[PDB]
Design an enzyme around this catalytic site. Structure first.
Site, PDB file in Angstrom:
ATOM      1  N   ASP B  17       0.834  -1.188   0.000  1.00 48.33           N
ATOM      2  CA  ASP B  17       0.000   0.000   0.000  1.00 48.33           C
ATOM      3  C   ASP B  17       0.874   1.245   0.000  1.00 48.33           C
ATOM      4  O   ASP B  17       1.819   1.349   0.787  1.00 48.33           O
ATOM      5  CB  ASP B  17      -0.916  -0.009   1.218  1.00 48.33           C
ATOM      6  CG  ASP B  17      -1.983   1.045   1.144  1.00 48.33           C
ATOM      7  OD1 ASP B  17      -2.829   0.966   0.230  1.00 48.33           O
ATOM      8  OD2 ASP B  17      -1.976   1.955   1.997  1.00 48.33           O
ATOM      9  N   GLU B  68       1.484  -0.430  -5.184  1.00 47.08           N
ATOM     10  CA  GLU B  68       0.602   0.710  -5.427  1.00 47.08           C
ATOM     11  C   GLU B  68       1.508   1.930  -5.508  1.00 47.08           C
ATOM     12  O   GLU B  68       1.819   2.568  -4.503  1.00 47.08           O
ATOM     13  CB  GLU B  68      -0.444   0.835  -4.328  1.00 47.08           C
ATOM     14  CG  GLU B  68      -1.495   1.890  -4.601  1.00 47.08           C
ATOM     15  CD  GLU B  68      -2.477   2.045  -3.459  1.00 47.08           C
ATOM     16  OE1 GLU B  68      -2.096   1.772  -2.304  1.00 47.08           O
ATOM     17  OE2 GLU B  68      -3.633   2.441  -3.714  1.00 47.08           O
TER      18      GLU B  68
HETATM   19  O1  LIG Z   1      -6.318   5.991  -6.143  1.00 48.02           O
HETATM   20  C1  LIG Z   1      -6.158   5.876  -4.724  1.00 48.02           C
HETATM   21  C2  LIG Z   1      -6.309   7.245  -4.090  1.00 48.02           C
HETATM   22  O2  LIG Z   1      -6.097   7.148  -2.688  1.00 48.02           O
HETATM   23  C3  LIG Z   1      -4.710   7.064  -2.265  1.00 48.02           C
HETATM   24  O3  LIG Z   1      -4.525   6.763  -0.851  1.00 48.02           O
HETATM   25  C4  LIG Z   1      -3.726   8.100  -2.862  1.00 48.02           C
HETATM   26  O4  LIG Z   1      -3.146   8.906  -1.833  1.00 48.02           O
HETATM   27  C5  LIG Z   1      -4.440   8.992  -3.854  1.00 48.02           C
HETATM   28  O5  LIG Z   1      -3.463   9.691  -4.637  1.00 48.02           O
HETATM   29  C6  LIG Z   1      -5.322   8.171  -4.783  1.00 48.02           C
HETATM   30  O6  LIG Z   1      -6.086   9.069  -5.601  1.00 48.02           O
END
Ligand SMILES: OC[C@H]1O[C@H](O)[C@H](O)[C@@H](O)[C@@H]1O
Ligand SMILES: OC[C@H]1O[C@H](O[C@H]2[C@H](O)[C@@H](O)[C@@H](O[C@H]3[C@H](O)[C@@H](O)[C@@H](O)O[C@@H]3CO)O[C@@H]2CO)[C@H](O)[C@@H](O)[C@@H]1O
Ligand SMILES: OC[C@H]1O[C@H](O[C@H]2[C@H](O)[C@@H](O)[C@@H](O[C@H]3[C@H](O)[C@@H](O)[C@@H](O)O[C@@H]3CO)O[C@@H]2CO)[C@H](O)[C@@H](O)[C@@H]1O
Ligand SMILES: OC[C@H]1O[C@H](O)[C@H](O)[C@@H](O)[C@@H]1O
Ligand SMILES: OC[C@H]1O[C@H](O)[C@H](O)[C@@H](O)[C@@H]1O
Lengths: 210, 382, 193
Positions: B17, B68
């Site tokens: 993550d 991610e």
């Molecule tokens: O796509 C997942 C979303 O949540 C995440 O925690 C990221 O910080 C953000 O940049 C993203 O847009």
């Protein structure tokens, strides 16, 4: 005193092979649970020989099984077999291989790297090699020149990631060991060996089992 | 910790993550600490020591390592995550491009075609393969597959933070009316769109990933950030799965079809020898900004040849099929058809009759497609 | 050629006037290209009862089209069509194409006995998904499609699987669409939904 190997077949099934040492030979119990994919019974073609030891209903018909025995005083070896249903069709691992199990040597553990002594007394060997795709362990007894024993490691059972490993019931009668990697018969010194032998120049040294 | 989870608990892989935070350097390298006096904390690194240690670990090196590749600090590293030719990634660009093409947006035919090929423009240059791309349309965070075709905007008032949570750029389309109470045409279009998303996911090169419940049309009521709800909005509804068993059947059949095809789970990027791009007419793809149709044909070692087509335009089209002398195209998948004819299997007693009812189109190498729909055909000898 | 013969028969049977066809045209009688067989006692000028059995699909289509003309009130008009009942459509309803490049003619007509009848002729070399007139509360039902293989070129209640055949195009019909081949024609009936 047994070791289980659960091979995933290529027809959505499982094959459990239990290897148990005898108090001297070895007993290999193969068990096919499930149903459907094996509808009609199957036979254990051990190396495709004229034998085959047909599996008989062992547990309520749900668990088909067979039992094989191997003579004592035999050096560590590999039982390779296939399963053939009652129509001639073959059954293979999910890697399109023949179910192969070790006899005389346990699976082992990937850690600690080097040679370890377990609570029971079994000796664990672990070595890292990413380049190699074939590793074997040589055990030398008191003088030896050539290995007193050679144990090839199955790349699927005796390997976690890039750490080849193998456990042995005991090393009695053996004083040193070495690793053969890639396929070149030259013995190699275990990097993590804490005790080593005397250098000999080609160059040669063996990690002590003491 | 990772080695413990792999050796003791027999885990096969890890998804990290906000993995980009693992690229940011530590303060130990600030020239004040090292050298005693005058790079700084939080600066992304080219070869982060932690990712180097994971990639080249004796054990962890040979497990799945999905990343991610971004964080909440503004770092975004899709296609650039320090990989050593080992790490995979959550392809967010695939998600964006597919969401935008399948909803009828201009200028995404070329990007969509690149997505269908494993994103070579991201992973091929660096030495990685198509399967290092983890293709996904929906995840735990964001709209579900059913919400992706039901709501234009998020509804996060239940989170309590004045609807300030979750992605604001969802790239979603309510397929007409908004909400679960719409006309029959909107509902049929939504079914088509769900099947189109699944088909695009299951015919692309890479690893198809989908979230639980997307196989039967799970809905969170438009809430695209349900991190703080211990009730049925986040539960798998086994009673609602039976109601929508048609979509589940279609998804299962699509996964099985991907498994059977030799030319979908490719170990390398598709080459022009195997993969040919078509438009409404064979061999003439439309790559312009106005294009909303993407079709291709792939040679298959088990299926012979498969023709896939996506019509994201709002207009129906009778698409001509490639001319293969001595052969005919046999319909397999059409997301516009009513169930169970959206996917034809031998378990349908009247499959032959269904094929015969369109034989007059298939004999002249044609197929009539509805708007916002996809088709898959197989080349059978004839 | 089969499609074109059916198109000629449909054109003949959906026009105001009195249709007429020479004997044998119902099964596809061929004179071997001879345009003016006026001095022959050969089989070239004879009705071939052994051949109208082999070509029973076209003969069935012709009989069904004649019966359909008989049933329709809108096709046996005693006076010329009135714009109140007859409406002209193109590839999209309500937008006929009368240009010199046009090769598509479609119309809808109110019929006091049947509802509404939609007829379309696509004489061009390209297929076409034509939109059907928007009639809330009703849906069009396939009746004739000259491109279909027999016996589905003219659906009738004598077919054990007419419902299945209609269901297999229901996804096009629900959107008020019909896919037509090149050089084809279709007839649909407006039924309550
Ligand atoms: O796509 C997942 C979303 O949540 C995440 O925690 C990221 O910080 C953000 O940049 C993203 O847009
Ligand atoms: O895009 C214009 C084009 O298509 C129109 O039909 C639909 C579009 O194809 C479709 O994309 C959709 O537009 C939505 C966007 O996808 C999305 O960003 C959304 O949140 O808002 C848009 C709609 O509010 O819907 C339109 C129809 O509403 C249209 O029919 C064509 O005439 C036009 O050429
Ligand atoms: O056929 C094998 C080939 O497939 C893929 O190439 C296609 C691209 O995916 C696709 O985007 C498109 O590229 C065109 C652009 O969209 C367009 O703007 C224009 O400038 O031309 C481009 C190519 O001529 O079509 C190509 C194939 O024509 C894949 O990416 C390749 O790796 C693969 O070799
Ligand atoms: O920062 C830009 C990117 O941030 C996030 O990680 C989002 O997932 C992505 O959609 C966005 O484009
Ligand atoms: O404001 C809190 C936000 O933090 C994150 O970056 C998440 O992407 C977002 O879903 C969440 O709402």
């Amino acid at each position: 005193a047994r070791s289980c190997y659960r091979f995933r077949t290529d027809d959505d099934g499982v094959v459990d092979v239990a290897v148990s040492g005898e108090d001297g030979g070895y007993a290999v119990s193969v068990e096919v649970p499930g149903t459907r994919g094996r509808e009609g019974g199957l036979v254990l073609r051990a190396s495709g020989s004229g034998e085959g030891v047909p599996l008989a209903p062992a547990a309520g018909g749900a668990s088909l099984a067979a039992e094989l025995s191997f003579d004592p005083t035999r050096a560590p070896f590999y039982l390779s077999f296939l399963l053939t249903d009652a129509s001639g069709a073959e059954i293979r691992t999910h890697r399109k291989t023949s179910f192969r199990v070790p006899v005389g040597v346990g699976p082992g553990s990937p850690a600690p790297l080097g040679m370890s002594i377990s609570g029971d007394g079994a000796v664990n060997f672990a070595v890292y090699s990413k380049n190699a795709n074939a590793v074997s362990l040589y055990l030398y007894a008191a003088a030896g020149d050539e290995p007193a024993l050679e144990i090839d490691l199955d790349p699927y059972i005796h390997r976690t990631g890039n750490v080849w490993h193998v456990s042995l019931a005991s090393v009695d009668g053996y004083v040193s060991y070495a690793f053969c990697c890639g396929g070149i018969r030259r013995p190699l010194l275990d990097p993590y060996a804490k005790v080593i032998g005397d250098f000999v120049s080609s160059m040669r040294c063996f990690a002590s089992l003491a | 910790c990772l080695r413990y989870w792999v050796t003791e608990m027999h885990v096969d892989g890890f998804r990290f993550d906000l993995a980009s935070i693992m690229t940011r350097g530590c303060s130990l390298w600030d020239p004040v600490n090292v050298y005693g006096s005058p790079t700084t904390t939080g600066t992304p690194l080219a070869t982060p020591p932690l990712i180097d240690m994971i990639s080249n670990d004796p054990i962890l090196g040979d497990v799945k390592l999905i990343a991610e590749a971004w964080d909440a600090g503004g770092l975004y590293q899709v296609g650039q995550f320090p990989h050593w030719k080992i790490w995979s990634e959550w392809n967010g660009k695939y998600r964006d491009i597919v969401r935008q093409f399948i909803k009828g947006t201009d200028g995404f035919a070329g990007g969509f075609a690149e997505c269908l090929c494993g994103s070579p423009h991201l992973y091929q240059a660096g030495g990685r393969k198509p399967w290092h791309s983890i293709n996904f349309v929906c995840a735990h965070d964001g709209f579900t597959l059913a919400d992706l075709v039901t709501y234009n905007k998020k509804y996060n008032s239940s989170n309590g933070e004045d609807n300030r949570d979750g992605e604001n750029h969802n790239l979603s389309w309510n397929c007409g009316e908004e909400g679960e109470f719409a006309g029959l045409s909107v509902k049929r279009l939504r079914k088509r769109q769900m099947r189109n998303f699944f088909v695009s996911l299951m015919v692309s090169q890479g690893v198809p990933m989908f979230y639980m419940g997307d196989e039967y049309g799970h809905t969170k009521g438009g809430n695209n950030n349900t991190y703080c709800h211990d009730h049925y909005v986040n539960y798998f509804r086994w009673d609602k799965k039976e109601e929508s068993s048609d979509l589940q059947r279609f998804c299962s059949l699509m996964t099985k079809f991907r498994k059977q095809c030799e030319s979908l789970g490719l170990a390398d990027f598709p080459t022009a020898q195997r993969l040919h791009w078509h438009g409404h007419q064979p061999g003439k793809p439309d790559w312009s900004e106005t294009s909303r149709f993407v079709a291709f044909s792939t040679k298959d070692e088990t299926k012979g040849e498969i023709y896939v087509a996506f019509n994201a335009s709002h207009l129906p089209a009778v698409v001509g099929l490639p001319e293969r002398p001595g052969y005919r195209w046999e319909p397999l998948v059409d997301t516009g058809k009513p169930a169970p004819y959206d996917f034809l299997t031998d378990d349908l007693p009247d499959r032959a009759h269904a094929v015969h009812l369109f034989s007059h189109f298939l004999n002249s190498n044609l197929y009539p497609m509805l708007s916002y729909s996809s088709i898959i055909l197989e080349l059978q000898p004839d």
